[PDB]
């Protein structure tokens, strides 16, 4: 009986993966794509900024008395080129390592989950049917206490085997469904951890490049008196 | 004579500020605007990403056996909200503190530099003219050795005073022009240093938020065997 409760729970996990998880995953992939289209816009415009800033650098470089401000501006653009390319690194961790691999799994998963649920439903119904029918055969013999005929005991053995088989099937089927769910969330968490490690390397790079060059830049226009 | 060389150098510095520096600065302001329009695109799309990621979080949260993966995904979105808002901080250091103040100075500088150069040109020509004319008056007396009349010596004193006045005027005018140039590059370098300090605080924030949470995230789907 708790068997039937478990059977419905199992059906519900497959339905939850197919109608909630995978569509939400489709949406997450679409946001990721938008995000990367945006991030490309910002990389590009960062370019035009830092070229316009090297232009001002070239002008100072050619003057009397502001040459080292020319150097400062060159270095600010350079620091940004180094920071940017630690960002373009995090960016491809995003495309090849996250968006592509999610798209690849979710594509195959439609067929895979429709087939698994269906195979499970068929097997569970076929074991249920065979059990009910053994039980009916027995109820027939038994209708027309501590006494069993040879054939009654054979039916008893068979019902006991099929009932054990059915309960194990439903028990394992439930564990397997919960494991299918956890795998899909684990993979998602893993792909996010990998982009994260690259965000950490990008932010660490920026801190140390700036920590290096900023105090010299702040000194360039200080009172020398 | 080296006076005339210095006079032309001075004219050239004002021409360089008005025809090279300020137009390049106009262009830099336009790139900065584009850059900030882009950066707004990326902040927005980062939003849609991290909402789609909280959605996946909510799903794990409601399951049997993947709840703590729900927590992990919540924390990844949270870390991103904290990183983003240290970025929105660097962003307004960019708008109110850099783009606005550059636009404000370059607006008034057109009139200011046209007027300064012009005032200088007029004063320098007026001192030159007066000197030449004193000198001609003297050459007249002197035409029709170690002998000077009272009036010849008075002209000599006056020429010497005007010539000293002219040379100081050109000498100071050159120093002042080079100082006008250096001020405009200094201000530019200062506004960039201020945005930089905020980039440093944004990258430092990201490093430490990730340093904190990443190892727990990497543990969430490890073999427990």
């Amino acid at each position: 009986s708790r068997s039937e409760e478990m059977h419905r729970l199992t059906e519900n996990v497959y339905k939850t993966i197919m109608e909630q998880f995978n569509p939400s995953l489709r949406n997450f992939i679409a946001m990721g794509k938008n995000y990367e289209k945006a991030l490309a816009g910002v990389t590009y415009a960062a370019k035009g900024y830092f070229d316009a800033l090297v232009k001002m650098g070239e002008l100072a470089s050619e003057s009397q008395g502001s040459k080292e401000l020319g150097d400062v501006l060159f270095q600010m653009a350079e620091v940004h080129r180094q920071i940017q390319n630690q960002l373009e690194e995090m960016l491809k961790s995003f495309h090849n390592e996250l968006l592509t691999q999610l798209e690849q799994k979710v594509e195959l998963d439609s067929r895979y989950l429709s087939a698994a649920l269906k195979k499970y439903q068929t097997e569970q119904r076929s074991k249920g049917d065979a059990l009910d029918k053994c039980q009916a055969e027995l109820k027939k013999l038994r209708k027309k206490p501590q006494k069993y005929s040879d054939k009654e005991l054979q039916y008893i053995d068979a019902i006991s085997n099929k009932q054990g088989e059915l309960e194990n099937y439903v028990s394992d089927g439930y564990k397997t469904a919960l494991t299918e769910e956890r795998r899909r969330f684990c993979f998602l968490v893993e792909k996010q951890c990998a982009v994260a490690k690259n965000s950490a390397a990008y932010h660490s790079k920026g801190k140390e490049l700036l920590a290096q060059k900023l105090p010299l830049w702040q000194q360039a226009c200080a009172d020398p008196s | 004579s080296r006076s005339e060389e210095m006079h032309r150098l001075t004219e050239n510095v004002y021409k360089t500020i008005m025809e090279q520096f300020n137009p390049s600065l106009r262009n830099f302001i336009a790139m900065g605007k584009n850059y900030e329009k882009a950066l707004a695109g990326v902040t927005y799309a980062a939003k849609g990403y991290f909402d789609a990621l909280v959605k996946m979080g909510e799903l794990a949260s409601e399951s049997q056996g993947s709840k703590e993966l729900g927590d992990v995904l919540f924390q990844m979105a949270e870390v991103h909200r904290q990183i983003q808002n240290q970025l929105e901080e660097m962003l307004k250091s960019f708008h109110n503190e850099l783009l606005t103040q550059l636009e404000q100075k370059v607006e008034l500088d057109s009139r200011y530099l046209s007027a300064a150069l012009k005032k200088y040109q007029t004063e320098q020509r007026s001192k030159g003219d007066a000197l030449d004319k004193c000198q001609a008056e003297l050459k007249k007396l002197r035409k029709k050795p170690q002998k000077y009349s009272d009036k010849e010596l008075q002209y000599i004193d006056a020429i010497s005073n005007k010539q000293g006045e002219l040379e100081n005027y050109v000498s100071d005018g050159y120093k002042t022009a080079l100082t006008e140039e250096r001020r405009r590059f200094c201000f530019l370098v200062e506004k960039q240093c201020a945005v930089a300090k905020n980039s440093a605080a944004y990258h430092s924030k990201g490093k430490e938020l990730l340093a904190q949470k990443l190892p727990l995230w990497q543990q969430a789907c490890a073999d427990p065997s």
Partner: peptide
């Protein structure tokens, strides 16, 4: 030929 799980080798 039954259908292969796209997540077969994902550790939990």
């Amino acid at each position: 030929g039954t259908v292969q799980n796209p997540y077969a080798d994902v550790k939990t």
